[PDB]
Design a protein around this nucleic acid. Structure first.
Ligand SMILES: [Mg+2]
Ligand SMILES: [Mg+2]
Ligand SMILES: [Mg+2]
Ligand SMILES: [Zn+2]
Lengths: 107, 125, 124
RNA sequence: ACCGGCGGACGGCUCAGUAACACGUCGGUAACCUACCCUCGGGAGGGGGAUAACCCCGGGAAACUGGGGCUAAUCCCCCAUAGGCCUGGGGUACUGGAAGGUCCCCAGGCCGAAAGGGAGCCGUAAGGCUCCGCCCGAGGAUGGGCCGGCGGCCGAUUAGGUAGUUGGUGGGGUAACGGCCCACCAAGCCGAAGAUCGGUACGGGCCGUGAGAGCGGGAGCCCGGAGAUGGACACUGAGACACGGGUCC
């Protein structure tokens, strides 16, 4: 099966209705890539991305980081320290609006 | 009364000072606690955009479906259990997901009576 | 108490007004809206009022009234007191606008000395 | 003049509040509503009812307001049919990056339309012929609701903050997704890369100044937000919790 990203699906199936690979969830919008930094809550991870911001007056750069909370389906089940790919969806809780769709490099 | 606009708390824990009045299009309504009764009773609600909702307040019949695709209209005896609230079963409150007992067996409700106005259930084995 | 009576003959479309006081009016104090009472018992030269032959033992029933300050009587409020409530239609309010509601001062059903006008109709 | 229809939610005014998804920008809604307007496909069958205006009598200092008589509609209410919504079982016709969507066939229910009305000619009459109109479905358009990433103030003589608080499962409610709100199960969430608290302030396109790099401002014109003596809350409507509409303190 393909859901529009053109990447390989997870090996095993699941029963989560909020799983894009095996359930009713639909993805549309941005796609980001990042590193997991927290996995304490059930089915929730925190993903960090780093980028550079240009300071025009001082003609130099500074490093900034963006942290996003993502839904973690049981068929993928990412852990702290690995690279993941996330996609935008409809609101799922107060702070969750993304879902993990692939683990690119296990820790 | 019932305002479904936004929370007054930031995810960090700090407070938010409201910057406007409550708009009319953000209000909710009293829950309908659909009970088991001898005679059925429903009302009509005029909703945003001038649409309608049928609200069921007392239920006496139900539609039960088997795995073969046939259905029967039978009457409801009682609510065996309701995982949504701890004290719904004692008060005989029907919501989606409740287990009801009928004259042909136990059934699990699949519709939302407060939003649709009928009680549909699938037969248990 | 002194009462100003408005008697309407429903079969003709004509009404007459007279003033009644004393033991005659003291009889009427206590009657609600929608109850009958004979006119002969009260005492009124009815055939002279309208100039027409009228049936024997004919009676009348109270339809409404207005108190001494200008507020009317509302059939659905029990007792003789005066209240101030929110209305959307009916006696004591004329809307003029769609869905409008307003707070008005009204009376009850039972007659009392504070009343001045009494509207009744003839019942055969 | 009255009943009835459409409009009065735009336009105009001010900058108190607000350090926030308020605003700028790029995206999303497969999670949503929309009277007026455009195109295509259909429908207009049968009954009932009151009441203002008008006549009789009025009440109150006025603001306002009572009873009886009679009458009409593109006013109101029923019955039918079309139609809509929910759930279970099958089929694979459509769009799309991808179907909790659309389409076809069974089955159990709930809701449930309409004004062939008005004007003008040919009509001997029969009846046409235009003009303006009523209801349902599919789509658009117009006007919005909601969501996300990024961007732009000062203070450490403010260092720890949060307990529906962060997430999960089952529901309710909403036009719609969501701790938006409940019942149960866990211990999460934010922070010296400055949380929390305090100060000051409507945001932007822009404007003043300077060789430039910069520094300072953001009343007047346009686009967005908010308010109608202060604080709370409802009715009607496609749209309001309504500046020249309603209720309480
Ligand atoms: Mg200010
Ligand atoms: Mg019908
Ligand atoms: Mg500023
Ligand atoms: Zn899965």
């Amino acid at each position: 099966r393909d859901i529009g990203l053109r990447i390989q699906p997870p090996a095993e199936k699941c029963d989560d209705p909020k799983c894009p690979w095996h359930g009713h969830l639909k993805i549309h919008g941005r796609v980001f890539e990042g590193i997991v930094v927290s996995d304490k809550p059930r089915k929730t991870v925190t993903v960090e991305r780093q980028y550079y911001h240009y300071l025009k007056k001082y003609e130099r750069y500074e490093l900034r980081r963006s942290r996003i909370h993502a839904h973690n389906p049981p068929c993928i089940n990412a852990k702290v320290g690995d690279r993941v790919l996330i996609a935008e969806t409809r609101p799922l809780s107060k702070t969750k609006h993304f879902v993990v769709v692939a683990v690119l490099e296990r820790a | 009364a019932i305002w479904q606009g936004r929370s007054l708390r930031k995810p960090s824990g700090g407070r938010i000072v409201l910057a406007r009045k409550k708009r009319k299009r953000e209000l909710g309504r009293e829950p309908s606690n659909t009970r088991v009764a001898e005679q059925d009773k429903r009302k009509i609600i005029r909703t945003y955009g001038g649409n309608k909702k049928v609200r069921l307040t007392a239920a006496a019949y139900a539609n039960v479906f088997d795995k073969s695709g046939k259905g029967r209209k039978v009457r409801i005896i009682r609510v065996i259990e309701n995982p949504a609230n701890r004290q719904f079963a004692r008060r005989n409150i029907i919501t989606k997901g409740a287990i009801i007992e009928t004259e042909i067996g136990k059934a699990k409700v699949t519709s939302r009576p407060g939003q649709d106005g009928v009680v549909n259930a699938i037969l248990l084995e | 108490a002194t009462f100003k009576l408005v008697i309407s003959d429903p079969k003709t479309g004509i009404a007459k007004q007279i003033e009644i006081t004393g033991p005659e009016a003291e009889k009427l104090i206590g009657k609600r809206i929608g109850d009958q009472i004979p006119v002969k018992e009260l005492g009124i030269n009815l055939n002279e009022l309208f100039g027409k032959e009228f049936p024997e033992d004919v009676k009348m029933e109270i339809r409404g009234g207005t108190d001494k300050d200008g507020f009317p009587m509302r059939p659905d409020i029990h007792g003789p007191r005066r209240v101030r409530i929110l209305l959307s239609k009916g006696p004591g309010f004329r809307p003029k606008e769609k869905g409008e509601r307003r707070k008005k001062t009204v009376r009850g059903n039972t007659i009392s000395p504070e009343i001045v006008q009494v509207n009744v109709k003839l019942v055969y």
